[PDB]
Amino acid sequence: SSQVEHPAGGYKKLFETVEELSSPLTAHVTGRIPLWLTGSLLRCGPGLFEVGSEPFYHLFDGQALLHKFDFKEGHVTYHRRFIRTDAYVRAMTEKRIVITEFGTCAFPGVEVTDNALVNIYPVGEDYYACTETNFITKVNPETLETIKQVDLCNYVSVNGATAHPHIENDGTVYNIGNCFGNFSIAYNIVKIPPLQADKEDPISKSEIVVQFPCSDRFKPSYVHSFGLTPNYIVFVETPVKINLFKGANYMDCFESNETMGVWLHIADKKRKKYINNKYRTSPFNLFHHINTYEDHEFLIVDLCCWKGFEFVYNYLYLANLRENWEEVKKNARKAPQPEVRRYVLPLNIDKADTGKNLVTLPNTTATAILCSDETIWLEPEVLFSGPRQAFEFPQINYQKYGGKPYTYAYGLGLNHFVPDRLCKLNVKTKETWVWQEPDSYPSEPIFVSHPDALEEDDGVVLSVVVSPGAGQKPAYLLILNAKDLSEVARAEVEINIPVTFHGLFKKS
Amino acid sequence: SQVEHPAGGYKKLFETVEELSSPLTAHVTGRIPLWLTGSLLRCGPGLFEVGSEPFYHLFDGQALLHKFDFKEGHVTYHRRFIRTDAYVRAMTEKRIVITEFGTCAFEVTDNALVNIYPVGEDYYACTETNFITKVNPETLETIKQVDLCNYVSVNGATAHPHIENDGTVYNIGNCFGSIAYNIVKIPPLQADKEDPISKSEIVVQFPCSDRFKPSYVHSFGLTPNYIVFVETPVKINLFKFLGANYMDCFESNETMGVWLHIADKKRKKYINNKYRTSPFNLFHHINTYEDHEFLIVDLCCWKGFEFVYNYLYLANLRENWEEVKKNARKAPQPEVRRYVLPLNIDKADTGKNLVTLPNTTATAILCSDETIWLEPEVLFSGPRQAFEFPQINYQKYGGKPYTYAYGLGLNHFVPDRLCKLNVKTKETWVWQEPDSYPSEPIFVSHPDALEEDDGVVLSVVVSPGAGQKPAYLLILNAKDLSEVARAEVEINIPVTFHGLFKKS
Ligand SMILES: CCC(CC)C(=O)Oc1cccc([C@H](O)CCN)c1
Ligand SMILES: CCC(CC)C(=O)Oc1cccc([C@H](O)CCN)c1
Ligand SMILES: CCCCCCCCCCCCCCCC(=O)O
Ligand SMILES: CCCCCCCCCCCCCCCC(=O)O
Ligand SMILES: [Fe+2]
Ligand SMILES: [Fe+2]
């Protein structure tokens, strides 16, 4: 066995419109749903890929659909509702595309999209669906009703914020976004506090804690996520640049800087100060940090990388993802290559070590060379590398190991950009585990710990799987044992489920 | 699972020995394959001081030629110092006369301690200078000194010439074009029976990144159609060259990274493709081959621009284990890397990955300035654990698609294991015994083999632990590196670098 093939083309169902439900369906359980598993798997993704005869072009254009699998006493329900954003509501009103999406211009001031199709996260006692703009949407996690639109610009100085905020155990939320900060561009870290006794909305207490500089005065890098430890914030500035100068959509504004490579930045979290260490390495795209942690006076930075400066999103138009298998493979031939990489950033830079490798840790092959111009050139330790086989959408045991020394990551395996397997990676030994079934296309795995867990990987991962082959249920919730990715149960439904990006498990 | 060497036996690798007058019989354990007939010839330092005057660097000790003979399941061992100018004059004057790599004498060295290779019907021991030494492969007698400058325009040549099946020899060396690098070609022995070295010629020249500073070059790549040269940031400062030794002339260029160069072998033409990547040291190419208009370039790399030789002074290699580990903490990290070089550069693909091969994660980005930026596929990576001194089934798979490489495993620069690497699957095999320090493994095919790894590997092992024979020849099955036999001797054997198996 080598290359897994998908000639039947079932992955097309990931990109096909569905209708919302009026109320939850019961799901047919096979195997055994863990009896300790009590709560809601909430996930976001596109659900409407055209408004009548007007199509959406890009993967990130379809209208936000909020999904929920509920678990109780070994039984499972499924429910979904479109998020009532301005983009969706106005589209349903005017029966056309009203708001410009990432890769779809709307034809008839700057009406920025609030299509919150990417992720959902808690703030205080509330939950917010999001994309990557200034608009986030408050949602009801039980009914999936849309509550309110929130403009972050009303509270803090950012043009947007990522769909990947970090959330500390006390409920503090950290996020990053491009801003104006000289009349130069910069990146601001936003901090949203936990809900206090006064019970006021935490978003009204938002503040900028630290600012990162920009490599280009007028062009911020695209930032999808960032790293957080107890003491440090890590930001990776990639050569994918947003041209603020330039019937255009967002996608038309991106360009690749050929000469800058990647700049890595650290800030002291507690002292709220940028550290002027000029970390540099070769060009790559970065969407998802896996995890970050401190080891002696070094930051361990585990990344899902794409080797090259070409923007990976160029390969994610719906027309291309809907092609037949042979064409899908051909399309990916010249794309950046995915690779899981560990970078190690020294915090203590001694001039006496100019010209030498500063990474004195015993358990890594990552290096960091102090140059005479004071730049620190980084080389990674490669943890996982497969030909056009990405370990993507990484997840860990976040609550206990986020920002801390860890061993295990879980991922969605992309086969020429098509999700077709689930993966587990031991980041110390590089051992992997895989779950895969033919004609089955899974989603990001989310880890849920066993309540009496002793080890890091004592629990399950949850994934939403599309399996449209005739003589099969069209979709199901997959439960794997986190130890070995062995199948524990499925909760089958008799309707299609389109692609979802990110989500969370809300314990009850 | 760090392997430790507190007993410090590796120090015997760097201890002077005496030559033999004639071969010793070796005590065989296990079974020597009966098809194994010939001589394992290997070179290394054997004399690490001249009286009270010490040699300082690993590459300074006086060349010692070793030989294990195999016949009908029996093994002999023999060694003789090579009678170079450096050795002869040292024995005459009872001091260090010629400056060695890292030892100034208080006249370029011909201390041929590195390798031995065939030219026509002859065998030459070599270092990396213009002087190579003809030797008798049966008696180990020194025959004569040859100056390559008498024949071709090069200042020196590597100890890693490529040798085609017909006997054609290719090598590279720095020269004067500006500085440049010349490929030397020595033809096979013809019917006229004249010395092939007298028919030497420069076939192609590579340009230099710096007008006055050539990169150090230890080896290069060769396929049926192409020559691959890797120009590293380790530079030789000819100004500071012309009480200094060779080591004092090296410096690291911080900004250039690595430049890769290809030349058309048959059309004898340099190809102006500006391949670029991040900085590393390179000593040993593993293998090179052509795959559908791409060159696959497998390298043993060291991550960084600091010269790895800085860590190879004898004083440092002789320290106790805890000190040896501490010394290597800030050294470049070893890594086996596969680079893929596109031969077809289309402007229409500017900004994109040109490596469309299905079986690699290596990339090559065409930039607007026309440089091609390379990223490798990593084949092997261990913390301060080098897969080094690589060997393949060279006669049948050299320059061609291949699967298997064999290597010496370096533990903080100390050789302590033998390794096999599947370069397609990245599966490895290991042979290792405590207090045993092996040498470069050399692959010998079963003469009727159709498979790539159907044979044995030979390694010379030092094992000085009390209640043991001090050294032995190890024979492993090439399939799984399982032990087949040993040929034990009752004398020490110092470190050897490279060599060959001469079939008889
Ligand atoms: C040009 C400004 C950028 C960044 C501030 C922006 O807003 O980019 C998006 C605009 C709309 C949607 C999206 C999707 O969420 C991307 C997929 N995760 C990104
Ligand atoms: C500075 C000029 C260079 C030529 C590139 C040179 O001559 O370097 C050496 C001089 C003497 C000995 C050696 C050893 O063989 C190195 C270890 N294999 C190298
Ligand atoms: C589950 C998605 C399958 C379709 C193809 C996915 C390709 C993803 C490429 C790398 C990750 C880029 C970020 C997308 C997810 C997000 O919006 O957070
Ligand atoms: C077997 C030698 C052990 C001692 C330390 C060896 C470290 C070698 C570093 C990489 C290879 C450098 C070139 C040395 C061999 C040669 O001269 O051809
Ligand atoms: Fe994401
Ligand atoms: Fe060598």
Is A283 in Cβ contact with B365 (below 8 Å)? yes
C-alpha separations of A232 from A210, A275, A348, A403, B26 in Å: 11, 10, 14, 9, 62
Buried residues in A1-30 as b, exposed as e (16+ CB within 10 A): eeeeebeebbbbbbbbbbeebeeeeebebe
Nearest-Cα residue of chain B relative to residue A335: B353
Distance, CA of B172 to CA of A389 (rounded, Å): 39
CA of A61 to the centre of ligand 3 (A): 13
Q: Do A42 and A67 meet the contact criterion of CB atoms below 8 Å apart? A: yes
Distance, CA of A174 to CA of A107 (rounded, Å): 36
Q: Which residues of A touch B254 (CB under 8 A)?
A: 355, 371-373
Residue B154, C-beta contacts closer than 8 angstroms, at least 6 positions apart: B130, B148, B173, B174, B175, B182, B184, B202
Token match 């099955």: residue? B477
N-terminal to C-terminal alpha carbon distance within chain A: 43
Query: In the sheet where A63-72 sits, what is the strand order?
Result: A25-26, A75-82, A63-72, A39-48, A502-507
CA of A172 to the centre of ligand 6 (A): 57
Token match 């499925």: residue? A490
Torsion angle, alpha carbons of B227, B228, B233, B238, to 10: -10
Distance, CA of B495 to CA of B107 (rounded, Å): 26
Tell me which residue in A336, A339, A358 faces B353 most closely, judged by beta carbons.
A336
Q: Do A226 and A269 meet the contact criterion of CB atoms below 8 Å apart? A: no
CB-based contact (8 Å) between B225 and chain A? no
Distance, CA of B102 to CA of B61 (rounded, Å): 10
CA of B428 to the centre of ligand 4 (A): 21
3-state secondary structure of B238: helix
Strands (E), A385-453: 389-395, 408-415, 418-426, 432-435, 446-449
**Residue B467's CB: how many other CB atoms inside 10 A?**
4
Distance, CA of B97 to CA of B119 (rounded, Å): 29
At B391, list the tokens: 């060997």
- Write the burial class of residue B357 (CB in 10 Å: 0-12 exposed, 13-18 middle, 19+ buried): middle
Angle at B245 between CA B242 and CA B250, to 5 degrees: 75
C-alpha separations of B122 from B39, B145, B420 in Å: 15, 13, 31
Distance, CA of B472 to CA of B460 (rounded, Å): 6
Q: Return the half-sphere exposure (C-beta side, CA atoms, 13 A cut-off) of residue A495.
A: 17
Q: How far is CA A115 from the centre of its chain?
A: 16
Token match 């037949």: residue? A324
What are the backbone dihedrals phi and psi of residue A278, each rounded to the nearest 5 degrees, phi first?
-90, 80
Distance, CA of B372 to CA of A174 (rounded, Å): 39
Is B377 in Cβ contact with A385 (below 8 Å)? yes
Angle at B368 between CA B364 and CA B373, to 5 degrees: 25
Angle at A53 between CA A52 and CA A59, to 5 degrees: 85
CB-based contact (8 Å) between A255 and chain B? no
Distance, CA of B471 to CA of B461 (rounded, Å): 6
DSSP A421: E
Q: Do A114 and A135 meet the contact criterion of CB atoms below 8 Å apart? A: yes
Tell me which residue in A333, A371, A387 faces B361 most closely, judged by beta carbons.
A387
Nearest CA-CA partner of B344 in B292, B288, B268: B292
At A415, list the tokens: 């086969």
Token match 């760090």: residue? B2
> Quick one: which H or E segment has residue A15?
none
DSSP states along B383-449: TTEEEEEEE--HHHHTTS---EEEEEEEETTEEEEEEEEETTT--EEEE--TT-B----EEEE-TT-
N-terminal to C-terminal alpha carbon distance within chain B: 42
Q: Which residues 13-52 of A are in CB contact (within 8 Å) with B? A: none
Q: Distance, in angstroms, between B72 CA and closest chain A CA?
A: 43
Tell me which residue in A282, A357, A362 faces B330 most closely, judged by beta carbons.
A357
Q: Is the CB–ligand 1 distance for residue A113 below 6 Å? A: yes
In which region does residue B74 sit, left (phi positive, over 0), alpha (psi from -120 to 50) or beta (all else)?
beta
DSSP states along A327-374: HHHHHTTTSPEEEEEEEEEES---GGGTTSB----TT---EEEEPTTS
Written in H, E and C, the secondary structure of B433-480 is: CCCCECCCCEEEECCCCCCCCCEEEEEEEECCCCCCCCEEEEEEECCC
Experimental method: X-ray
- Sign of the Cα torsion A286, A287, A290, A291 reads positive
Q: Which residues of A touch B2 (CB under 8 A)?
A: 362
Distance, CA of A96 to CA of A109 (rounded, Å): 18
At B243, list the tokens: 């009480």
β-bridge partners, A121:
A128
**Residue type, position A138, single letter:** K
Q: How far is CA A430 from the centre of its chain?
A: 22
Distance, CA of A203 to CA of A205 (rounded, Å): 5
Distance, CA of B175 to CA of A74 (rounded, Å): 78
CB-based contact (8 Å) between B344 and chain A? no
Q: Is the CB–ligand 4 distance for residue B10 below 6 Å? A: no
